[PDB]
Amino acid sequence: ISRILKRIMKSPVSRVELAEELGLTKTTVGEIAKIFLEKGIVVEEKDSPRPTKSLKISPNCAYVLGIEVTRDEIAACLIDASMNILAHEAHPLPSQSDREETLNVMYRIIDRAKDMMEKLGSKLSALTVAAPGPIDTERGIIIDPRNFPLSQIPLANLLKEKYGIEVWVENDADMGAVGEKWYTKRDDSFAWILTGKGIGAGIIIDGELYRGENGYAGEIGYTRVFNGNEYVFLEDVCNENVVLKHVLSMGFSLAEARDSGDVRVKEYFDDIARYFSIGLLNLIHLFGISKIVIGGFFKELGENFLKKIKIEVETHLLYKHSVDMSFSKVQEPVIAFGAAVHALENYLERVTTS
């Protein structure tokens, strides 16, 4: 294999650094550098301080689009090969959208990105669609049994056909995690937790995305939770809808609740933090991780809510050791962005292999 490409993407790096840090011959890398450097994928430049030259990905060699699909909205993120965001957007969907209605918005978005590059004399080279639930990553199909207008449909294929580019389909929480990895320049281990409409985790280990054998991983949304009457999934309780709909009962705006200073709100948020923790504790106790990053809906609850989760987790932890809870602070769209970067690796990995 190669994937010095993986490292050149990580950051500018010289031939000596690659050969040493990865392990290989000066003549092996020197030749591959010749290919990359010829294909217009990479460039060599003197470093800002005898002297030395590094390898950098050339922004011009690839433009790719990432997309996130939710029940209420579709977001897109267009990047160059340096993963600079050229444009990002979001098109809401109508109440209860069809297969056909949802696809139309998606086609619209892709046509917009295809056209925008073509007017700038270049092209859209590939695309990665991010969606909820389990996914057939090899065939490019959304397996999610739950009512989604894009389930059991050869999505990658119909897009490939229609557009003549490379298309992948990928779990949304996984792509959120990929988004944090790159936007934060991390290479450690953590879990990126998706919240709002759906619950799930993207699991990153030593900088790589963790993958399951059956199209899913980190699925903490199916954590069995007993509410006092019957059992429910953790996803049914943390759902952004169920939360605000319940606050319609409370009387309280979506935010005002906390500003209300009502014990009833405190105890309701405590209920959710407790449940949520059960799922986090599973991840921690099973994967043996320490770092967790929360994204989406739960950000809106603030550090007052994060303090409770921290506490619930400290309390029920297997033994006393440090655990880092945090919110994501990536400017939106974090999932569409991760999906875009996913498309970039996979497109560059494919182009070099030929």
Determine the longest span between alpha carbons in the chain, in angstroms: 73
**Residue 171 binds which of K ion, a copy of itself, none (CB < 5-8 A, kind-dependent):** K ion
Which span sits near a copy of itself by CB under 8 A: 104-112, 119-127, 220-228, 336-344?
A: 220-228
Does position 65 interact with a copy of itself (CB under 8 A)? The reply is no
Residue 135 CA, chain-centre distance (Å), reads: 14
Tell me, what DSSP letter sits at residue 150? T
Report the residue number, 167 or 283, with the smaller CB distance to a copy of itself: 283
Which span sits near a copy of itself by CB under 8 A: 38-46, 72-80, 207-215, 260-268?
A: 207-215
- Least separation in angstroms between CB 23 and a copy of itself: 8
E runs forming strands in 179-273? 190-195, 200-205, 208-209, 224-226, 231-233
- Least separation in angstroms between CB 78 and a copy of itself: 31
Bridge-based pairing of strands 126-131 and 166-171 is parallel
Give the separation between CA 77 and CA 92, rounded to whole angstroms: 15
Report the residue number, 144 or 166, with the smaller CB distance to K ion: 144
The correct pick among 216, 269, 297, 298 for binding a copy of itself (CB under 8 A) is: 216
Give the separation between CA 9 and CA 3, rounded to whole angstroms: 9
**Residue 223 binds which of a copy of itself, K ion, none (CB < 5-8 A, kind-dependent):** a copy of itself
Residues 262-321 that bind a copy of itself (CB under 8 A): 278, 281-283, 285-290, 316, 318-319, 321
- Least separation in angstroms between CB 110 and a copy of itself: 28
Q: What is the per-residue burial (b if ≥16 Cβ within 10 Å, else e) of 271-298?
A: ebbbbbbbbbbebbeebebebbbbbbbb
CB neighbourhood size of 50 (10 A): 3
DSSP-assigned states of every residue in 64-114 = EEEEEE-SSEEEEEEEETT--EEEEEEEEPPSS--HHHHHHHHHHHHHHHH
Report the residue number, 251 or 288, with the smaller CB distance to a copy of itself: 288
Report the residue number, 122 or 326, with the smaller CB distance to a copy of itself: 326
Residues engaged in binding a copy of itself (CB under 8 A): 134, 143-145, 189, 201, 211-220, 222-224, 226, 278, 281-283, 285-290, 316, 318-319, 321
